Write a protein that binds this ligand. Structure first.
Ligand SMILES: CC(=O)N[C@@H]1[C@@H](O)[C@H](O)[C@@H](CO)O[C@H]1O
Ligand SMILES: CC(=O)N[C@@H]1[C@@H](O)[C@H](O)[C@@H](CO)O[C@H]1O
Ligand SMILES: *[C@@H]1O[C@H](CO)[C@@H](O)[C@H](O)[C@H]1NC(C)=O
Ligand SMILES: *[P@@](C)(=O)O[C@H]1CCCC1(C)C
Ligand SMILES: C[P@@H](=O)O[C@H]1CCCC1(C)C
Lengths: 538, 534
């Protein structure tokens, strides 16, 4: 008949879940819960509408479809890229979320972790194997929630001002899911008064944008930003550049029969097959680049009343705890996607000329003067032409500019203006990593340890990596529970101190115990965060 | 009667003097007139050759010091007084000095020609620290040094005017170099082997003779100590030179109008001391390491900026010796940087550091200043007083000396010259400046001249041996274009734009290092010009 633990009533109606085996014991999963009406046809580009209630029992027993998105084909069959590609069918009918909870259901309200995946706002899915929430829930006995949100043009094409494609609807998808958590998580044993958002890359930037948008800020209590920030040069776009990209995309697919009435242009875009839009998505970028994505949140005064830097600088953050961090080699992954001389399949020992050309690819759309300032800071003038050093320096350019320095600026401003901040650098290169050795610890490869994937018996992680994963999961849930990653009552472990704008302390996460260090690439980030903006104004 | 001390030059006959050194005697001829006195109507004009005289010129004592400002910041302090005039001031100052071995050489001897520094506003060949007797005895060279006009008298310029054309102090030096060509053989010197050496504004002067074709035939090698003609202080454009000349006229009660002739005529009626009293006030702002009347780029002595001439030059066949002291900037900080004094530790605050950056890098945009602060801040310790003191010393020294010298060395090397570079890292046991100043600007000179060998001074035995080493390097270079002694040393390798090798000079054996502040000088030499022009 029925298992009462696998049956739950939410405001929309009744749900049936599944019981998941894990190495440490059973977990209840409710996968594929509809939280919005499907944004098909006339609802493409529009804000999400809440799911209408249903009679009977919805089977929330497997992940639903991946939101329509480009699929990477740079290295076909390569494990390092395929792990990020969709593992369900692509559909515009994709607005579903997932809830994992302990089995049996918690007796008293349990803190909630809400995951927001990355993928540059053009890709990603909550169903990816590396986001499997069963291990976190089993190890640390929280409730975990993840949602799908529209990406690409479907989530972020913006004709600012228009009613028909206002932009930012993917962020509205995320907000609706968070509202769902407030109204419904108690039914699963979750505590709506203790919700911790966490996300990586574009998911981290999304987390930050919810920090900076007052209507979202009521829906959670803490935040974890892994390898991303809302103030990154890739994470937002201005109203005019968003309109330009939307209009060129419409133009490239025949709309209209180049601007005109916004209503007629969007109506024509709605008649195009989803895959047709995806096929032209990368062609609207203003130049060849890496770490730039066509359709991203737009600063239009609505979701974001100002740029994220301005909101960060002007914000009062007392009563907030954040945990932020980066991996050791943020920049390496992206270089093989356009930097001249780079391949995962050789050592990418570039020339000086290839370094100079790469600077313009990795810092697109800046003046020649600005590019020269980059070359000045990242050249070692005792060894200006050494290939190994140039390869490392271009990786630093791309990673500092897009991840480390935006994270460091956010960390410093939030700490100075009232928040308790904890910062990390993730320094372990997984035994199973398929990218070449020169890429180091690439962007995105801490996620599997945070989610406890090494505990999966069918995988081949070493034993101390399982210990490491257990330690990280324990750092993440303590912060979720207490706003403090340190273990409630001890002076045994070397202790993780808060990050402040003065001492700038952070810890290294790897197989050895915590080591405290100073400065999130402070000399470099002073260039990106303090000087370079003065140069672009003048 | 001592025939060794009697010489006939083209203008007439001279009587010299025998001097003692710890190694034996030398012959000195001091106060030889090489130009007509540039007095009255000749103020501001190019020098005229000295007309012949009858009788015997008394050349046994130094002549007058050219009119100049006298430092009064620390009255009676040895560290400033050793640079102040030690003879009476006069516009009748164009004399030069020759030291030769005793008895005079009877075989052509290589010649060293010393051009003193002093910001183009001060200096004298008669200063104790330039005493040429020890080099000549120990290394058996002929040594010549001249007085040249400084301040407004040597470099006031109304460009285009015939009454104050500018650069006449540089022409005083050229005239003395022509005098050497015509007369040095009468002393035993070889006019075909003349090495110019100078320090600070003297080194900038050496460099300008390198880049001016009428001077290039007057010497064969060059030594540039802590200075370069491409310094931001060593030259001035025509427009700013004219502005400074006209503000001096106004400050001393002269016209305009307007008309250059009437302006200069009125300036010529003013006592020399009056011009000196207003010299500092024609500068456009509060500053350190800036001087009012310096060489002017007007297309004549210099047909282009020294930067341009250095980049466009064919320097095959040139040998140069260049170098810097370990702490070029420290001395200058006590003359205007907020919070600095020789009498305390000068542990400044961030606010003083930021104000000091506009004093030490004057007349640049706010954006340029911000880039300086970016590069010279340690952003892990942005507020640490000791690090701020050191950093502002580095700003002043890099901008004014180290990076102009590094640029000269790299361009000359890459365009055919053989370059030797050094950093002088010995703090004199006798130094009277505070310890935080390190090895300041100018404090290698006394070692090059072998002053430590003077038994009435307090130098250590190891310091005397060190002076003897340096005198040997300098004279080896004058003789052969190569400072190295026969392999024992380690060897002193040439400086190249790629390897950037130089040696450290101190009590320990030579140690070869790479890069003359390469990271800081990429900022000053490569990036900052792009920023200022865009
Ligand atoms: C000896 C060996 O290769 N063992 C396993 C292999 O059976 C499995 O297919 C793989 C999965 O990643 O992990 C490893
Ligand atoms: C440290 C030391 O001995 N310094 C000497 C001092 O004794 C002597 O009185 C002075 C003469 O002016 O020369 C110096
Ligand atoms: C074109 O846009 C206007 C509003 O801008 C709208 O009212 C009108 O209905 C649109 N055209 C058609 C044919 O509907
Ligand atoms: P300048 C750059 O000419 O240096 C002088 C300042 C006063 C004493 C000197 C000769 C070292
Ligand atoms: C910066 P984010 O969008 O980076 C994405 C790209 C694929 C893997 C990933 C790290 C989740």
């Amino acid at each position: 008949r029925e298992d009462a633990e696998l049956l739950v009533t939410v405001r929309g109606g009744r749900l049936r879940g599944i019981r998941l085996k894990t190495p440490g014991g059973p977990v209840s999963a409710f996968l594929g819960i509809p939280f919005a009406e499907p944004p098909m046809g006339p609802r493409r580009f529009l804000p999400p509408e809440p799911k209408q209630p249903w009679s009977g029992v919805v089977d929330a027993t497997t992940f639903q479809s991946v939101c329509y998105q480009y699929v990477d084909t740079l290295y076909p069959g390569f494990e390092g890229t395929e792990m990020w590609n969709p593992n369900r069918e692509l559909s515009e009918d994709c607005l579903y979320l997932n809830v994992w909870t302990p089995y049996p259901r918690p007796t008293s309200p349990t803190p909630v972790l809400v995951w927001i995946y990355g993928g540059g706002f053009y890709s990603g899915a909550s169903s990816l194997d590396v986001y499997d929430g069963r291990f976190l829930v089993q190890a640390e006995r929280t409730v975990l929630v993840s949602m799908n949100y529209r990406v690409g043009a479907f989530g972020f094409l913006a004709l600012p001002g228009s009613r028909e494609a206002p932009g930012n609807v993917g962020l509205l998808d995320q907000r609706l899911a968070l509202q769902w958590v407030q109204e419904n998580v108690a039914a699963f044993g979750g505590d709506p008064t203790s919700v911790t958002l966490f996300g990586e890359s574009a998911g981290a930037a999304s987390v930050g944008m919810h920090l900076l948008s007052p209507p979202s800020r009521g829906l959670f209590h803490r935040a974890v930003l892994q390898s991303g920030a809302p103030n990154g040069p890739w994470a937002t776009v201005g109203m005019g550049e968003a309109r330009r990209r939307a209009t060129q995309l419409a133009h490239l697919v025949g709309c209209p029969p180049t601007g005109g009435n916004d209503t007629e242009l969007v109506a024509c875009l709605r008649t195009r097959p989803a895959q047709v839009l995806v096929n032209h998505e990368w062609h609207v970028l203003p130049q060849e680049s890496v770490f730039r994505f066509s359709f991203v949140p737009v600063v239009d005064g609505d979701f974001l009343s100002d740029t994220p830097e301005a909101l960060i600088n002007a914000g009062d953050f007392h009563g907030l705890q954040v945990l932020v961090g980066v991996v050791k080699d943020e920049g390496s992954y992206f270089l093989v996607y356009g930097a001249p001389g780079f391949s995962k399949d050789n050592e990418s020992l570039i020339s000086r000329a290839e370094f100079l050309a790469g600077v313009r690819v990795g810092v697109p759309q800046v003046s020649d003067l600005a590019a020269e300032a980059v070359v000045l800071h990242y050249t070692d003038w005792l060894h200006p032409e050494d290939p190994a050093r140039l390869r490392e320096a271009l990786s630093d350019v791309v990673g500092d500019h897009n991840v480390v320095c935006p994270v460091a600026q956010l960390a410093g401003r939030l700490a100075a203006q009232g928040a308790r901040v904890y910062a990390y650098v993730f320094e372990h290169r997984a035994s199973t990593l398929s990218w070449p050795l020169w890429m180091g610890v690439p962007h995105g490869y801490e996620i599997e340890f945070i989610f406890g994937i090494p505990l999966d018996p069918s995988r081949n992680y070493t034993a101390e990596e399982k210990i490491f994963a257990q330690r990280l999961m324990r750092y993440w849930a303590n912060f979720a529970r207490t706003g403090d990653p340190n273990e409630p009552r001890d002076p045994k472990a070397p202790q993780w101190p808060p990050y402040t704008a003065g001492a700038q302390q952070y810890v290294s996460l790897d197989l050895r115990p915590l080591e405290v260090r100073r400065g999130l690439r402070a000399q470099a980030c002073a260039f990106w965060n303090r000087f370079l903006p003065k140069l672009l104004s003048a």
